[PDB]
Amino acid sequence: TNEFGIFNSLWFSLGAFMQPRSLSGRI
Amino acid sequence: TNEFGIFNSLWFSLGAFMQPRSLSGRI
Lengths: 27, 27
What we know:
Number of strands of chain A: 0
Radius of gyration of chain A: 11 Å
Organism of A, B: Rattus norvegicus
Oligomer: part of a larger assembly
Keywords: Cryo-EM, transport protein
Distance between the termini of chain A: 27 Å
Number of helices of chain A: 2
Chains A, B: Glutamate receptor 2,Voltage-dependent calcium channel gamma-2 subunit
Entry title: Cryo-EM structure of GluA2-0xSTZ at 8.7 Angstrom resolution
Helix content of chain A: 55-70%
PDB class: transport protein
Structural class of chain A: mainly alpha
C-alpha cells in the first residue's frame, strides 16, 4: 500500500510535469 | 534487432517532432 502511493505520486508528478471525467480532479 | 532500433528511432523522432508513467523518460 505504501509503494502504491509512490507509483501514484510519481504519476501525479508526471501529470504535474506539464502538457476520465472525474469532475473532482477534472476542474 | 537493428531494424527494431530504426523503427524506435523514428518513433522517438516523432516524439521529438513536437506536440505510460515511465518516470525516467517522463521527466
